[PDB]
Design a protein around this ligand. Structure first.
Ligand SMILES: C[S@@+](CC[C@H](N)C(=O)[O-])C[C@H]1O[C@@H](n2cnc3c(N)ncnc32)[C@H](O)[C@@H]1O
Length: 385
């Protein structure tokens, strides 16, 4: 929260409304965007603010305050411009309300997130040609739970995404400003440069036929690398480890070492290019040959790629086939032949790190399945014929 001034200024500069138009700020509180817009564009507008907490609603006399749950409020009028910084979070009573939300919002998938709902509601309250400018996390660009939100936006209007990054005081959230015009078109991806005067936009690329696919920062080098290799997801089955509880509810699993016992490995045992079979980080041990009973692949030496180490590719070949409590487990597909040592070297390479960092920056904190499935494998490390 607490939208930094330079961010509010940037958003206000992308905003527009016809003289007399209705300007709305959902989850307004004291109305930071209502005020800023008026100061920058003028008084000739109808300013409206919606707040649910009667103790937060602190608006000037020129603004029409409204106490309601934006997500469930049904006004009788559409709006020209919607400005705001929607609440970031899940389920906030809670589960009770959540179900009404789940039935009210069509883009709601998985645990979703409140900001996605605000976006859909906002678009639905917009009149044709209307404009919304929101600051939100960058997770919806790549995450699976936001696939429906992406399709929605793509089909309802033209979308512009301005990458800001980690601009808020709390540093682990990457922000993005979305400028949506309810006048169908495609997607424009912009980057920004932070200077003393604030942000300066820089057009990165445009996708006029965008229909909701993941948004990435592509360059000629990424494109090149991807067309000249095959997707890792065509050569391997990506499997998931058993969660810690499965192990604890499994007999033969001890919480103290002993002879014949092997440590249940975690992401701390995975190093770039090697596995540390020595240090136990889970506090669980079990007879190696018994791991096969939790997941069959535990008995097969295979490739392990990290999902806990952030947005980078850390991989190793588990030659010993130990039980794992996490990470991605890759099993080659039928007929795929590969060179483990060179594949591993390739995945941990600088070029691979540069490639991934270029595309997804810091949108999300960990490498996801969708990012992993598309990693290009040079045909000289593995192939299916
Ligand atoms: C992200 S804050 C934005 C505050 C302020 N506009 C700013 O930019 O700093 C969302 C505010 O709207 C209110 N709010 C939270 N959940 C809401 C909901 N479901 N419906 C309506 N208002 C909500 C809260 O009081 C909260 O202060």
């Amino acid at each position: 929260v607490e939208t930094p001034p330079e961010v509010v200024d940037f958003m206000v500069s992308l905003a527009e409304a016809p003289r007399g138009g209705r300007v709305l700020e959902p989850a307004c509180a004291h109305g930071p965007f209502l005020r800023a817009f008026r100061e920058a564009h003028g008084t000739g507008y109808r300013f409206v603010g919606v707040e649910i907490d009667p103790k937060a609603l602190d608006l000037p006399p020129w603004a029409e305050g409204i106490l309601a749950d934006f997500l469930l409020w049904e006004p009788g009028e559409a709006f020209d411009l919607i400005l705001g910084n929607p609440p970031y979070g899940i389920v906030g009573v809670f589960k009770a309300v959540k179900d009404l939300y789940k039935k009210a919002f069509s883009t709601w998938k998985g645990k979703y997130n409140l900001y996605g709902a605000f976006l859909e509601k906002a678009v639905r309250l917009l009149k044709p040609g209307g404009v919304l400018v929101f600051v939100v996390p960058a997770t919806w660009l790549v995450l699976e739970d936001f696939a429906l939100l992406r399709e929605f936006l793509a089909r309802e209007g033209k979308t512009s995404v301005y990458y800001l990054g980690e601009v808020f005081p709390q540093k682990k959230v990457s922000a993005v400003v979305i400028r949506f015009q309810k006048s169908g078109k495609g997607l424009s991806l912009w980057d920004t440069q932070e200077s003393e005067s604030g942000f300066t936009p820089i057009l990165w690329a445009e996708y006029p036929h965008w229909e909701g696919e993941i948004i990435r920062f592509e360059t000629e080098e990424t494109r090149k690398l991807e067309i000249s290799g095959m997707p890792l997801g065509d050569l391997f089955h990506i499997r998931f480890a058993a969660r810690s509880p499965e192990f604890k509810k499994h007999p033969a699993v001890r919480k103290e070492p002993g002879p014949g016992l092997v440590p249940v490995l975690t992401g701390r045992n995975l190093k770039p290019g090697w596995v540390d079979y020595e240090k136990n980080h889970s506090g669980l041990w079990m007879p190696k040959e018994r791991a096969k009973e939790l997941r069959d692949f535990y008995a097969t030496p295979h490739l392990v790629v990290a999902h806990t180490k952030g947005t980078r590719v850390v991989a190793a070949w588990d030659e010993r086939a130990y039980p794992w409590r996490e990470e991605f487990h890759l099993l080659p597909k039928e007929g795929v032949r590969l060179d483990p040592s060179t594949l591993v070297q390739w995945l941990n390479s600088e070029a691979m790190q540069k490639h991934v960092r270029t595309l997804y920056r810091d949108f999300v904190p960990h490498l996801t399945l969708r990012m992993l499935e598309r990693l290009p494998v040079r045909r000289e490390y593995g192939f299916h014929t």
